[PDB]
Design a protein around this ligand. Structure first.
Ligand SMILES: CCCCCCCCCCC(CCCCCCCCCC)(CO[C@@H]1O[C@H](CO)[C@@H](O[C@H]2O[C@H](CO)[C@@H](O)[C@H](O)[C@H]2O)[C@H](O)[C@H]1O)CO[C@@H]1O[C@H](CO)[C@@H](O[C@H]2O[C@H](CO)[C@@H](O)[C@H](O)[C@H]2O)[C@H](O)[C@H]1O
Ligand SMILES: CCCCCCCCCCC(CCCCCCCCCC)(CO[C@@H]1O[C@H](CO)[C@@H](O[C@H]2O[C@H](CO)[C@@H](O)[C@H](O)[C@H]2O)[C@H](O)[C@H]1O)CO[C@@H]1O[C@H](CO)[C@@H](O[C@H]2O[C@H](CO)[C@@H](O)[C@H](O)[C@H]2O)[C@H](O)[C@H]1O
Ligand SMILES: CCCCCCCC/C=C\CCCCCCCC(=O)O[C@H](COC(=O)CCCCCCCCCCCCCCC)COP(=O)([O-])OCC[N+](C)(C)C
Ligand SMILES: CCCCCCCC/C=C\CCCCCCCC(=O)O[C@H](COC(=O)CCCCCCCCCCCCCCC)COP(=O)([O-])OCC[N+](C)(C)C
Ligand SMILES: CCCCCCCC/C=C\CCCCCCCC(=O)O[C@H](COC(=O)CCCCCCCCCCCCCCC)COP(=O)([O-])OCC[N+](C)(C)C
Ligand SMILES: CCCCCCCC/C=C\CCCCCCCC(=O)O[C@H](COC(=O)CCCCCCCCCCCCCCC)COP(=O)([O-])OCC[N+](C)(C)C
Ligand SMILES: CCCCCCCCCCO[C@@H]1O[C@H](CO)[C@@H](O[C@H]2O[C@H](CO)[C@@H](O)[C@H](O)[C@H]2O)[C@H](O)[C@H]1O
Ligand SMILES: CCCCCCCCCCO[C@@H]1O[C@H](CO)[C@@H](O[C@H]2O[C@H](CO)[C@@H](O)[C@H](O)[C@H]2O)[C@H](O)[C@H]1O
Ligand SMILES: CC(C)CCC[C@@H](C)[C@H]1CC[C@H]2[C@@H]3CC=C4C[C@@H](O)CC[C@]4(C)[C@H]3CC[C@]12C
Ligand SMILES: CC(C)CCC[C@@H](C)[C@H]1CC[C@H]2[C@@H]3CC=C4C[C@@H](O)CC[C@]4(C)[C@H]3CC[C@]12C
Ligand SMILES: CC(C)CCC[C@@H](C)[C@H]1CC[C@H]2[C@@H]3CC=C4C[C@@H](O)CC[C@]4(C)[C@H]3CC[C@]12C
Ligand SMILES: CC(C)CCC[C@@H](C)[C@H]1CC[C@H]2[C@@H]3CC=C4C[C@@H](O)CC[C@]4(C)[C@H]3CC[C@]12C
Ligand SMILES: CC(C)CCC[C@@H](C)[C@H]1CC[C@H]2[C@@H]3CC=C4C[C@@H](O)CC[C@]4(C)[C@H]3CC[C@]12C
Ligand SMILES: CC(C)CCC[C@@H](C)[C@H]1CC[C@H]2[C@@H]3CC=C4C[C@@H](O)CC[C@]4(C)[C@H]3CC[C@]12C
Ligand SMILES: CC(C)CCC[C@@H](C)[C@H]1CC[C@H]2[C@@H]3CC=C4C[C@@H](O)CC[C@]4(C)[C@H]3CC[C@]12C
Ligand SMILES: CC(C)CCC[C@@H](C)[C@H]1CC[C@H]2[C@@H]3CC=C4C[C@@H](O)CC[C@]4(C)[C@H]3CC[C@]12C
Lengths: 613, 613
C-alpha cells in the first residue's frame, strides 16, 4: 500500500530556525430577548398545563423540604414562590423549575440548627422565639449565598463546576442521601433527639434514635411506611409499564391529599397524639433585613452551598438544553441564581436551585418557556393565600416519607462504584474519599475535602509519570521501549530516555532519579572519583510530552547538562515544543555555551547526528 | 552533511502491533556503622576543637531561642543538650548541629502563648504557675511533633519536602523573619504588650508596641542597639575581609560575655530597672509525662512544625553531604528527628532541628563526625551545672539583638523576587501568596495555604494548556503551527489539532472547546440541522503530549468520535503512547466499531493514509 518516504537534512533547532523563520444587554438577561418573539398561538395552552402540574408538585415539594431546614412549614411555600418570580427575568434555561432541593435544604438546616440549638436558645419551651431565630438564620444564610453567587457571576468564573468531577459528585450524592435519610427517619418516628453539631454527628444521631426507638408513635410510623410503599410501588410500575402513560403519575400529591383528608376526618391530632404541621401562616409576611453580623460564622458553609446549588442548576439546564438544541450561559446562571437567592433571603426564604424530578414533570407535560414557571408561582400563591387552613391536619411523616421514597436514585451509585474501580483506580479512590469525608465531616466540609483531594490526585498523577528507555526498530525511525517489544536494538554508546510529563520540582527529583537509573551512574560520584585519582558518551532526552516548565525545572536541566558535560558525556534534547523552548530562553537557560545546538526535532535526527561523529 | 532518509510502510497501531509484538540494621541506624571505622589517630583533635566552638555557640543560641518560645530561659539549655545526645545514635548526617531554630521556636511560642495567656491563666501575678503551664504546653507540643515525625518516617513518605517549592519557601522565610523581628523588637524595648492570637496578630502587636513606645527602657534599648550594630559590623567586615580568617568570628559570644560582665559589675537590675533573666535552674530536672489530652488542640500546628523542622534539617544535610561526597537517608532523618523530639518532650524541651549558622561554625572548625556534637553537648552540660549563676545578670535585650542581627539573610529575598517574576510569573505568584498568607494567618496556617496554592497552580497549569493547529513544512514530515512559520501549508480537507496536556475533566471541556474552534463548527448543531432538513472530512488529533487519561477523558473522546462520525467526519489519533492506549483499552474505549484502526504512530502516517483514499 502506501509507503513512508521522506528525504530532508538532519535538522537541529538552530538550523531549522535559521532556514525557516518563526513569527451590555446579555449580562442583565431580559425577558425582552424572547417575550416579543413569543408564539402565544399554540404555546400558551401547553405552558398553562405544565405550569399547573409543576405548581401542584412544587407546593408539596417546598412544604416537605421546609422540614429539612430547621424552619417551620409555611416558609417552604415562600421558598417555592419568590425565586421563580425573580428567576423568570434573569434566567437562561427555559425548562428548569426553580425551588428547594433536598440536599441544599439539608445543608441550610444543619447550619441553622448549629447556630440556634434548642437548649442553648431556650432555658425556660419557647417555640415562637426559637422559630423566629431559625428563620432569621436561614434568611441570613440565603442572603450570603446569593451575594457569593452574584460575585462569582461578576468575575465570570463559571468553569469551577469542572472541578466537581463525576466520582466526587457521586460520592457526595450518596453521602447526602444517607444524611437526608437519617434526618427524615428522625422525623418519621416522632422521636425526639438532641441535635449534634460537629464531627460524626450522623453516627450519634443514629445511636440516640435507636436508643429512643421505644418512644415511637404508631400512627406516624404507619403513615410514613404506607406513603413510602405506595410511592415506590407506583414509581416502579410507571417505570416498568412506561410505554403507555408517558408522563409520570403525581402519586405524591394524591397520597398527601388522601392523608390530609383522612387526618381531618378522624382528627388524629388529639386521639393519637399525632404530629401535624399545626401552623401555616395566612398571607404574606413583610420583608425584613437579615443581621449581617452573622456573616463571619457562615463562610465555609455558604461557599459550599452556592457551589452545589449552581452545579445542580447548570447540570439540569445543560441536560435539557442539549436535548432541545440551545445553549445556556454559565455566568448568567450565576447572576440569575445570586439575584434569586438575595431576593429570597430578603423575604424569609432558604436557598433556591432547580430539582430534576420537578423539572422532568414540568417538561414532560409540555413546557416551552418559563411561563410555566409563572403559572406554578401563581399556584403556589393560591395555596398560600387560601389553602393554608386545609393543610393543617397533614402529618409531617407523610412529607418525610415522600423524601425518603425519592432518595432511591441517589442511593443507587454504590452499584457503579466497582466498575469505576475496575476502569480507573484514581476515580474510585476519589469517589470513596468524598463519600467517607462527607459522612465523617459535614456536607460543606466534605465537598471541600473532596475537591482538594481531586487536586492532590491530579498533582500526584503528574508528579509520578511513565518513563522509558528507548531503542530503534531496525530500518525505521520508530523508537520504542527496549524491554517491551523484544526486537528493539539499543544504539551504540547512547541511551535515550523518555520522561512523559511536564518537569517541575517533584518531577525535578523524579527526573534526576530516572536519569541516574537509566545511565547506570551519576556524574557527581564519577567526577569526584576522577578528581581524587588526579560506557555511555551521549544521552538523548525525548521531551515530546513535557507540557510546561518552571524555574526549578530549568535549573535542574541546566545542572544536569553541566554535570554530564563535566565527565565528557553529551546531553541532547529532542521533540521539545516551541513554547517550552521559549520558556527555556526566558529563564536564562541558553547562557554559558549552550547555544541551542543540542536540540533536535525528533528522536531520529539526534541519532543520525551521533553517527556522523 | 547527514541526511534524513527512511523507507517504511505507513504503519497504523493495528498493523504495527500485528507485525511487531509487544511483551533491618539501617532503620535503627547504629553508631556501630561508623564508630568501629573511626580514625581517632587524627580526627579526634579536630572533632574536639569543633565541638568546643559549636558548644560555645549553641549554649548562647539555645538561651536566645528560649525567649522566642514562651518559656523561661534555662530550658533552652536542655533543648540544646538532649536532642544532640539522642541524635548522635540515629543520625545520618555527620556535619549538622542539632538544636533550636528561630522559626520553629517562634511557632512553638505562638502555640504556647495561645494556649496559656497571661490574663486567662492568672486573675490574681502568678509567674511560677504560668511558667509551669507554658513549659508543660511546650513539652506536649514537642512530644506530638516527634510522634508525627516518627510516624512519617515509618510510612517512608520522605518526598513531601519536594512539595515545599523554592518560591513558597522563600516567601515563608521572609514572613517568618518579619514575625521574629516583631517579637524580638517587643522584647528589646522592654514594653509590655498583651498577646494576640488569631488573624492579623502581628499588625495588632505592632500597633500596641508603637502606642506604648513611650514606656521604653533606655538601658535595654541601648544594649540591644549596640549588640545589633557590633554584630552586623563584624559580620560584614568578615564577609568582605574573607580571604584571611576563614572561620567566622564568634562575635555573639564575646558580646554576651562583655555585656553580662558589665551588668554584674554595675548591677543594672536595681539601678536602672533593667530586664535580666533573673532565674536559671541549677542542675537537671526530673522527667515528667506531658498531658496528652491537649493533643486535639495542636494538630494543625504540630504538622506544620514537623514539616518545617524536617525540611530545614534535610536541606542543610544535603548541602553538606553533596560537598563532602556522601548521601543522607530522608526516612532515617524522619526517624532520628522524631525520636529526638519525643525524647526532648519527655524532658521539658521545645522542638529541635538543625541551624545553618551553627552547622557552618561546626564544619568550618574541622568537623569530621558527630563527635563534635557530643563535645558540644558536654559544653552545654557544663554550662547547665556550673555556669548557671554567672549568666543571671545578662539582659534579654542582648539575646533578642543577636537574633535580630542574624535575621538579615532571611530578610534578603525580596531582592530576588523581581527576577523570579521576570522569569516565571507562577513562581512569583506562589512566593507573594506564601509571604502574604503567613502574615495574615500566621506561620502554621500560612505554610498549609502555600502548599495548597502550589497544588492549585500545578492543576491550573495542567488544565489550560497550549494547543495548536498544525500544517506541514513542504517536502518533509515536519508539522508546525500554521500561524507561526509563514511557510506552512494546511493539507486538503483535513485539520490537525495538537492538545499538549493530559486529558481530564477540566481538559475535557477545554478540548471540546478547542476542537469546536479549530474545525469551525460542532457536530451536534449540524447533525440537528440536517435532521430538521429531512468543509472538513477528516480531523487528526496529535496526542504526543497526553501524559495520562481518566474515565471522563475516555468518555469525552468516545463522544467526540461518535459525534463526528455521525456527520461523516473521520477522527484519527496520532502519537499516542502505549500506556495511554492500554488505559483506553481497559476503559472500554475500543467497543462499538473502533477496532484500533484509526491510530497512527506519528502525524505523517495519518496524512499519507488520507492521501491514499
Ligand atoms: C474560596 C475557598 C474556600 C474558602 C473557605 C472559607 C472558610 C472561612 C472560615 C472562617 C473562620 C476561620 C478563618 C481562617 C481560616 C483559615 C483557613 C486556612 C486553610 C489552610 C489550608 C472564621 O474564624 C473565626 O471564627 C470565629 C468562631 O470560632 C468567629 O466568631 C468570633 O467572632 C465573632 C465576631 O466577629 C463573634 O460573634 C463570635 O462569638 C466569635 O467566636 C470569627 O468571626 C471568625 O473570624 C472559621 O469560621 C467558620 O464558621 C464557624 C466558626 O465557628 C464554623 O462552623 C462550624 O460549626 C460546626 C461545629 O460547631 C461545624 O461542624 C460545621 O462544619 C460549621 O457550621 C466553621 O467551621 C468555620 O470554618
Ligand atoms: C496531614 C494533612 C494536614 C492535617 C491538618 C489537620 C488539622 C486538624 C484540625 C483540628 C480541628 C478541626 C477538625 C476538623 C478539620 C476539618 C478540615 C477540613 C478541610 C477541608 C479543606 C479540631 O476541631 C475541634 O476543635 C476544638 C476546639 O475548637 C477541639 O476542642 C474541643 O474539644 C476538646 C476535647 O476534645 C475540649 O478540651 C475543648 O475545650 C473543645 O473546644 C476539638 O477537640 C477538636 O475536635 C481544629 O482544631 C485546631 O486546633 C485549634 C482548635 O481551637 C486551633 O488553634 C488555633 O488557635 C488560634 C486562635 O485561637 C489560631 O490563630 C492558631 O492558628 C491555632 O493555634 C486550630 O486552628 C485548629 O485547626
Ligand atoms: C492524594 C494521594 C493518594 C492518591 C491515590 C491515587 C493515586 O494517584 O494513586 C493510585 C494508586 O492507588 C492505589 O493503589 C489505591 C490505594 C491508595 C489509597 C490512598 C489513601 C489516601 C488517603 C494510582 O493507581 P494506578 O496508577 O492506576 O495503578
Ligand atoms: C475522612 C477522609 C477519608 C478517610 C478514610 C479514607 C478514604 C479512602 C480510602 C481508601 C480508598 C478506597 C478506594 C476503593 C477501594 C476498592 C473498592 C472496590 O471496588 O473494591 C475492590 C473490588 O473490586 P474487584 O474487581 O472485585 O477486586
Ligand atoms: C491571604 C492570602 C493572600 C491574599 C492576597 C493575594 C496574594 C497574591 C496576589 C497577587 C500575586 C502577585 C504576584 C507578584 C506581582 C508582581 C510583582 C513584581 O515583581 O512586580 C512587577 C515588577 O516587575 P517589572 O518587570 O519591573 O514590571
Ligand atoms: C491558583 C489560581 C491562580 C493561579 C495564578 C498563576 C497561573 O497559573 O496563572 C498565571 C497568570 O498569572 C497572572 O496573570 C498574574 C495574576 C494572577 C493573580 C492570581 C490571584 C489568586 C489569589 C500564568 O501566567 P503565564 O501563563 O506565565 O503568563
Ligand atoms: C479551602 C480550604 C478551606 C478550609 C476551611 C476550614 C474550616 C475550619 C475552621 C475551624 O475549624 C472548625 O472550628 C470549629 C470552631 O467552633 C470547630 O467546631 C467545634 O465547636 C465546638 C466549640 O469549639 C467544639 O466543642 C466541637 O468539638 C467542634 O465541633 C470544628 O470542629 C472545626 O472543624
Ligand atoms: C489539610 C487541611 C487543613 C485545614 C486546617 C484548618 C484549620 C482551621 C480549623 C478551625 O479554624 C480555626 O478555629 C479557631 C477556633 O478557636 C479560630 O480561632 C478563633 O478563636 C476565638 C474563639 O473562637 C475567636 O474569637 C478568634 O476570632 C479566632 O482566632 C480560628 O480563627 C479558625 O481559623
Ligand atoms: C394514602 C395514604 C398514605 C393515606 C394514609 C392515611 C393514614 C392517616 C391512615 C392509614 C392507615 C391508618 C392506621 C391503620 C391502623 C391503625 C391501628 C389502630 O389501632 C390505630 C389507628 C391506626 C394507627 C391508623 C391511623 C391512621 C392511618 C395511618
Ligand atoms: C451513615 C453510614 C452508614 C454511611 C456509610 C458509608 C460507607 C461506609 C459506604 C458508602 C458506600 C460504600 C462503598 C460502596 C461500594 C463498594 C464496592 C465494594 O467492593 C464494597 C466496598 C465499597 C467500596 C463500599 C465501602 C463502604 C462505603 C464507602
Ligand atoms: C466487588 C464487586 C464484585 C461487587 C459487585 C456487586 C455490587 C454492585 C454490590 C453487590 C453488594 C453491594 C454491597 C451490599 C451492602 C453494602 C453495605 C452498605 O454500606 C451499602 C454499600 C454496600 C457495601 C454495597 C455496595 C455495592 C455492592 C458491593
Ligand atoms: C485531601 C485533604 C485536603 C484532606 C484533609 C482531611 C483532614 C484535614 C481531616 C480528615 C478527617 C479529619 C479528622 C476526623 C476526626 C477527628 C477527631 C477529632 O476529635 C479531632 C479532629 C480529627 C482528628 C480530624 C482532623 C482533620 C482530618 C484528619
Ligand atoms: C509586617 C508587615 C509590614 C509585612 C508586610 C510584607 C509585605 C507587604 C511585603 C513583603 C515582601 C514584599 C514584596 C517584595 C518584592 C516586590 C517586588 C516589587 O515589584 C515591589 C512589590 C513586591 C511584590 C513586594 C510587595 C510587598 C511585600 C509582599
Ligand atoms: C521592580 C524592580 C525594578 C525592582 C528592582 C529592585 C528591587 C530588588 C528592590 C528595589 C526597591 C525594593 C523595595 C523597597 C521597599 C520595600 C518595602 C518593604 O516591604 C520591603 C520590600 C520592598 C517592596 C522592596 C522590595 C525589593 C525592591 C523592589
Ligand atoms: C543590588 C540590589 C539587589 C539591591 C536592592 C536594594 C536593597 C539593598 C534594599 C532596598 C530596600 C531594602 C528593604 C526595605 C525594607 C525592609 C524591611 C525591614 O523590616 C527589613 C529590611 C528590608 C527588607 C530592606 C532590605 C534591603 C533592601 C531590599
Ligand atoms: C489556595 C487556597 C486553598 C487558599 C485559601 C485561603 C482562605 C481559606 C483564607 C485566606 C485568607 C482568609 C481570610 C482572612 C481574614 C478573614 C477575616 C475574619 O474576620 C474572618 C475570616 C477571613 C474572611 C478569612 C477567611 C479564610 C481566608 C479567605
Amino acid at each position: 500500500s502506501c509507503s513512508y518516504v521522506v528525504s530532508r537534512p538532519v535538522y537541529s533547532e538552530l538550523a531549522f530556525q535559521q532556514q525557516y523563520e518563526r513569527r451590555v444587554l446579555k449580562t442583565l438577561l431580559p425577558v425582552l430577548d424572547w417575550l416579543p418573539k413569543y408564539r402565544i398561538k399554540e404555546w400558551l395552552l401547553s405552558d398553562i398545563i405544565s405550569g399547573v402540574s409543576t405548581g401542584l408538585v412544587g407546593t408539596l415539594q417546598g412544604m416537605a423540604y421546609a422540614l429539612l431546614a430547621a424552619v417551620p412549614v409555611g416558609y417552604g411555600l415562600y421558598s417555592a414562590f419568590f425565586p421563580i418570580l425573580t428567576y423568570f427575568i434573569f434566567g437562561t434555561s427555559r425548562h428548569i423549575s426553580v425551588g428547594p432541593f433536598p440536599v441544599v435544604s439539608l445543608m441550610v438546616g444543619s447550619v441553622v440548627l448549629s447556630m440556634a440549638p434548642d437548649e442553648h436558645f431556650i432555658i425556660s419551651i419557647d417555640f415562637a422565639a426559637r422559630d423566629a431565630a431559625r428563620v432569621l438564620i436561614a434568611s441570613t444564610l440565603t442572603l450570603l449565598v446569593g451575594i457569593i453567587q452574584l460575585i462569582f457571576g461578576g468575575l465570570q468564573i463559571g468553569f469551577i463546576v469542572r472541578y466537581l468531577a463525576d466520582p466526587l459528585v457521586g460520592g457526595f450524592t450518596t453521602a447526602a442521601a444517607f444524611q437526608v435519610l437519617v434526618s427524615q427517619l428522625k422525623i418519621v418516628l416522632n422521636v425526639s433527639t438532641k441535635n449534634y453539631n460537629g464531627i460524626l454527628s450522623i453516627i450519634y444521631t443514629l445511636i440516640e434514635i435507636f436508643q429512643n426507638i421505644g418512644n415511637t408513635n404508631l400512627a406516624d410510623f404507619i403513615a410514613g411506611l404506607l406513603t413510602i410503599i405506595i410511592c415506590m410501588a407506583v414509581k416502579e410500575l410507571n417505570d416498568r409499564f412506561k410505554h403507555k402513560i408517558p408522563v409520570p403519575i403525581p402519586i405524591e400529591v394524591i397520597v398527601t391529599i388522601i392523608a390530609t383528608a383522612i387526618s381531618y376526618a378522624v382528627n388524629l391530632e388529639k386521639n393519637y397524639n399525632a404530629g401535624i404541621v399545626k401552623s401555616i401562616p395566612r398571607g404574606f409576611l413583610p420583608p425584613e433585613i437579615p443581621p449581617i453580623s452573622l456573616f463571619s460564622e457562615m463562610l465555609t458553609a455558604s461557599f459550599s452551598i452556592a457551589v452545589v446549588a449552581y452545579a445542580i442548576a447548570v447540570s439540569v439546564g445543560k441536560v435539557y438544553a442539549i436535548k432541545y438544541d440551545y445553549t445556556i450561559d454559565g455566568n448568567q446562571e450565576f447572576i440569575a441564581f445570586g439575584i434569586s437567592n438575595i431576593f429570597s433571603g430578603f423575604f424569609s426564604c432558604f436557598v433556591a436551585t432547580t430539582a430534576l424530578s420537578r423539572t422532568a414533570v414540568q417538561e414532560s407535560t409540555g413546557g416551552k418557556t418559563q411561563i410555566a414557571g409563572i403559572i406554578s408561582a401563581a399556584v403556589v400563591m393560591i395555596a398560600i393565600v387560601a389553602l393554608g387552613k386545609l393543610l393543617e391536619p397533614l402529618q409531617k411523616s407523610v412529607l418525610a416519607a415522600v423524601v425518603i421514597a425519592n432518595l432511591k436514585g441517589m442511593f443507587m451509585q454504590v452499584c457503579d462504584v466497582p466498575r469505576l474501580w475496575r476502569q480507573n483506580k484514581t476515580d474510585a479512590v476519589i469517589w470513596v474519599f468524598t463519600c467517607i469525608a462527607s459522612i465523617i465531616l459535614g456536607l460543606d466540609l466534605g465537598l471541600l475535602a473532596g475537591l482538594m483531594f481531586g487536586f492532590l490526585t491530579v498533582v500526584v498523577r503528574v508528579q509520578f509519570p511513565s518513563w522509558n528507555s528507548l531503542g530503534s526498530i531496525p530500518n525505521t525511525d520508530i523508537y520504542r521501549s527496549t524491554k517491551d517489544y523484544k526486537n528493539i536494538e539499543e544504539p551504540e554508546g547512547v541511551k535515550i530516555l523518555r520522561f512523559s510529563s511536564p518537569i517541575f520540582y517533584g518531577n525535578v527529583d523524579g527526573l534526576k532519579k530516572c536519569i541516574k537509573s537509566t545511565v547506570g551512574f551519576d556524574a557527581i560520584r564519577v567526577y569526584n572519583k576522577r578528581l581524587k585519582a588526579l560506557p555511555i558518551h551521549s544521552l538523548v532526552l525525548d521531551c515530546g510530552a513535557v507540557s510546561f516548565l518552571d524555574v526549578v525545572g530549568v535549573r535542574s536541566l541546566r545542572m544536569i547538562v553541566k554535570e554530564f558535560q563535566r565527565i565528557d558525556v553529551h546531553v541532547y534534547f529532542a521533540s521539545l515544543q516551541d513554547h517550552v523552548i521559549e520558556k527555556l530562553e526566558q529563564c536564562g537557560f541558553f547562557n554559558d555555551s549552550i547555544r541551542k545546538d543540542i536540540f533536535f526535532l525528533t528522536v531520529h535526527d539526534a541519532i543520525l547526528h551521533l553517527r556522523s561523529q
